[PDB]
Automatic annotation (TrEMBL), chains A, K:
The chain holds residues 23 to 103 of 103 of the full protein. GO terms for biological process: chromatin organization. GO terms for cellular component: nucleosome; nucleus. This is Histone H4. It is found in: Chromosome; Nucleus. The nucleosome is a histone octamer containing two molecules each of H2A, H2B, H3 and H4 assembled in one H3-H4 heterotetramer and two H2A-H2B heterodimers. The octamer wraps approximately 147 bp of DNA. Belongs to the histone H4 family. Keywords: Acetylation, Chromosome, DNA-binding, Methylation, Nucleosome core, Nucleus, Phosphoprotein. The keyword Phosphoprotein applies. It comes from Drosophila melanogaster.
Length: 81, 15, 19, 49, 91, 97, 42, 108, 98, 59, 81, 68, 93, 106
């Protein structure tokens, strides 16, 4: 796996921003958005993986993700809580 | 200084 | 006291690069 | 005359008597201190018969 | 075996709106919400008791907690409903 | 004679130079500024000290009485009209001063 | 009967506008995505 | 022989006994007042009924018989006190309330 | 007579007050305010000085944080004076207003 | 009872008058009868005036 | 009772902003700042009052203020609790 | 899925995922990103520009406090 | 009667820095942050135990709570020191 | 012999165990939990105190005051990250001036 930071593409950022109602966009936005997403994912994934490793475990379950997010204060409903 | 305090309440008021 | 006493080994040091 | 004044006097709270004395002195010195002379005017009926 | 509030949610829904259906995803959302808010209230009660150094969590403690967590009007309605439940229990 | 009064900016302007030897012979100050500015007067050494209207001193429980008592002095003079009018307790306070 | 003296606030007063106003009881709100879409479109 | 559940005695649909056991197992206190589980059951039932009513209103206005997460998001975000209550909560596939800043529109 | 230019005393006092630690809001007016608010919430609630001092500390912290956020926000609009729009924008983006 | 600071007519039309007192300031709206009284009393801006609400008398 | 919220002097707000490093302030900020402050205080004091009611004591204490702040998610050190 | 697989593989060897976990991560990512984007929109509006620029995101982050 | 960490705080400070002192204000602030961090770690461990359905908190529970709460580098050194302490205590037997 | 001594910890490991047991955080506490927690707390205290002392010495002062303590905590990014929601009474604020505000032309 390589260059997957690019894999998000521009059009995905476009559509997501479109949901946000932005009428006008700049080219530089994409790189910044990718960086923000990268650091967010890194933090969430580290929390989830440490939640997993506690349980003498190998498969990250949706419980690990949802409770990791809860520890980051971001509360998520609808996945078996 | 007592002098003024030695005039008790009714002694100030009078009858 | 003095900077030399602050440098003296007779204390619980911490090893972090920032400190 | 005011009954509450009498009660205050009965209390014997030296502060309260001192305050009463102060009010007396104020009344004697010039009535405007205790109560401004009310500017007299006719009674007003709400509505004519 | 596993137990969930889903059945009770379905019951109360049917009480509210007979002709209305509900998806499994929404059922799970509601179950997670009730579980979460129960947990929140229980923690608030625990913290309060700890400060007060009271070993018993009475309805009164839960009531004050409920006032803490919920917005004022929602808290008032919650406390009113809880007190009505208490009265019916007293019977 | 230095008349130590005024708003704080001019007050500190008047302070300027007080530490120099023989900057002034006598300083006159009001009890309000003594309770305000106690640090300045306490730091300096004041040889012979005089208090006018000592009847104001009368209450040893007052903070200004304590401050005045702390002030290092070589001699003390208390001036007041007719203190004997006052209750014995105040006379004792003054004698203790 | 009639108040010959009235107190007014220069910010709120004008002859143009006269206005006065006062199972949970709450105002209904419309989840009509069609109507909201119309509102934003118009 | 016959018996009646403490929920029916309270007049609540939620399982007050299950709430009591969950409280006890949660070790929140050494002693649990018998009024706590009933009070919890009552408040929980009220909240559930309120949210469900809001969702049902959203469903009817959408004219769909089955509540999907879209409806729940609509209900939660609309009711301003619940909106402020749950501001840190995201609902899966709930989406967002439509919103356009006036200055972005060409006119009107 | 000598006179500093607009903003010279600004920076001077910026430095001065940033250095100092002493509590900035007048004690007694704050105590009166909180007493009034409490009386609105419930009549005849007693407040010792420690409680009002703690609340005043918290208030100062919250306010200064808001001021910092608004200062950062305002310069982004190329301006050097904050305006109410900056206050409401910052508060809304904080998620306090919504 | 006030000293007068503004005199504006709502246009026989109501008058708008500002008043201050040692504790503060206030602006009042008076009926046309009071307006006639003030006009016939030779009140200027900066005059001190006494209004009894019950009778509508201006002195 | 009269109007204390206005009682918070303009210099108080000015100096607070001075700590914030802002150069200049529009006049309208004062009313907006007062509104923000009052709202904040209202919430905090509400929580403190209910806590005091729970304690059954007639006097509010620094502990109640600490718990009120903590519930708001604000942590205060030095006053205990 | 490629991004999350790569980040987890960097963080820990021989991990596995639940499919539901990956879906939840995607949902959470989208929610956060839409929130960030709307904040950026308000920032750009305040700037009096329709073109959102990186500084607008940075400001949004700072006011949020993710990088303060 | 009451209890506080102030004594130990003074001890450790002197071991780091004999010449430096603490006022009651700073001392109380230190006590408060120690209390806050202790509560945070204990509540995290309680959560993690209940989540795995374990009734007994353990060195693992505290280890993982510290992993979660502390920043990664600070966490790494905290866990290292904690491990050293735990192993030396156990060897004391 | 005190359990603290056997572990080699300054903080009262026994009191920590007492608090954890009484604090109803969990039904049972493994003997390794109090020692681990105690070591962690001691370590954190060590760093924060070291920073506070360094700040005090910077001032040329010798008694840590909330000003110095606040400086210490905010100077370290990760301690700030931990205490990001903590307010220190009499803490003050960091010196922060924007380059665009500096007088005169560049």
């Amino acid at each position: 796996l390589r260059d997957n930071i690019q894999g998000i593409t521009k059009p995905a950022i476009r559509r997501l921003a479109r949901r946000g109602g932005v009428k006008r966009i700049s080219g530089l936005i994409y790189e910044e958005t990718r960086g923000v997403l990268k650091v967010f994912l890194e933090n969430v994934i580290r929390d989830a993986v440490t939640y997993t490793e506690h349980a003498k475990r190998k498969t990250v379950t949706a419980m690990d993700v949802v409770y990791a997010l809860k520890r980051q204060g971001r509360t998520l409903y609808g996945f078996g809580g | 200084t007592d002098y003024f305090s030695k005039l008790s309440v009714r002694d100030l008021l009078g009858s | 006291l003095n900077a030399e006493t602050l440098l003296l080994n007779t204390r619980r040091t911490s090893k972090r690069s920032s400190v | 005359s005011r009954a509450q004044t009498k009660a205050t006097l009965a209390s014997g709270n030296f502060m309260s008597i001192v305050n009463c004395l102060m009010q007396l002195r104020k009344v004697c010195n010039h009535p405007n201190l205790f109560e401004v002379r009310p500017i007299l005017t006719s009674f007003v009926l709400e509505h004519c018969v | 075996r596993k137990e969930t509030y889903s059945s009770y949610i379905y019951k109360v829904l049917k009480q509210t709106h007979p002709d209305t259906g509900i998806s499994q995803k929404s059922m799970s959302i509601l179950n997670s919400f009730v579980n979460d808010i129960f947990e929140r209230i229980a923690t608030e009660a625990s913290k309060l008791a700890a400060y007060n150094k009271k070993s018993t969590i009475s309805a009164r403690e839960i009531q004050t907690a409920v006032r803490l967590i919920l917005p004022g009007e929602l808290a008032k309605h919650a406390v009113s409903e809880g007190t009505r439940a208490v009265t019916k229990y007293s019977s | 004679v230095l008349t130590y009064y005024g708003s704080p900016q001019q007050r500190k302007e008047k302070r300027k130079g007080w530490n120099k030897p023989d900057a002034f012979h006598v300083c006159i100050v009001s009890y309000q500024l003594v309770v305000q500015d106690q640090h300045s007067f306490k730091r300096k050494r004041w040889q012979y000290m005089v208090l006018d209207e000592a009847h104001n001193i009368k209450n040893f429980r007052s903070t200004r009485w304590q401050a005045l008592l702390n002030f290092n002095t070589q001699r003390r003079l208390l001036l007041t009209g007719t203190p004997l009018q006052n209750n014995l307790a105040e006379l004792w306070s003054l004698l203790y001063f | 009967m009639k108040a010959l003296v009235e107190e007014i606030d220069k910010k709120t007063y004008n002859p143009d506008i006269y206005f006065t106003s006062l199972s949970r009881p709450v105002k209904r709100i419309n989840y009509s995505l069609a109507d909201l879409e119309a509102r934003l479109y118009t | 022989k016959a018996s009646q559940s403490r929920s029916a005695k309270a007049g609540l649909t939620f399982p007050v006994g299950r709430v009591h056991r969950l409280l006890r197992r949660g070790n929140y206190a050494q002693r649990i007042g018998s009024g706590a589980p009933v009070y919890l059951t009552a408040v929980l039932e009220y909240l559930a009924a309120e949210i469900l009513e809001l969702a049902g209103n959203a469903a009817r206005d959408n004219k769909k018989t089955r509540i999907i997460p879209r409806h729940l998001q609509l209900a939660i975000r609309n009711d301003d006190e619940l909106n402020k209550l749950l501001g840190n909560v995201t609902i899966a596939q709930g989406g967002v309330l439509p919103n356009i800043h006036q200055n972005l529109l060409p006119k009107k | 007579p000598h006179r500093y230019r607009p903003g010279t005393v600004a920076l001077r006092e910026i430095r001065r007050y940033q250095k100092s630690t002493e509590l900035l809001i007048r004690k007694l007016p704050f105590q009166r305010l909180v007493r009034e608010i409490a009386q609105d919430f419930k009549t005849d609630l007693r407040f010792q000085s420690s409680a009002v001092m703690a609340l005043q500390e918290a208030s100062e912290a919250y306010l200064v944080g808001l001021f910092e956020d608004t200062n950062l926000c305002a310069i982004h609009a190329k301006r050097v004076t904050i305006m109410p729009k900056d206050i409401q924008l910052a508060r809304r983006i904080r998620g306090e207003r919504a | 009872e006030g000293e007068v600071t503004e005199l504006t007519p709502e246009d026989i039309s109501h008058v708008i008058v500002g008043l201050k007192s040692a504790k503060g300031t206030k602006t009042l709206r008076l009926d046309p009868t009071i307006y006639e009284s003030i006009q016939r009393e030779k009140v200027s801006i900066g005059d001190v005036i006494y209004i009894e609400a019950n009778t509508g008398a201006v002195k």
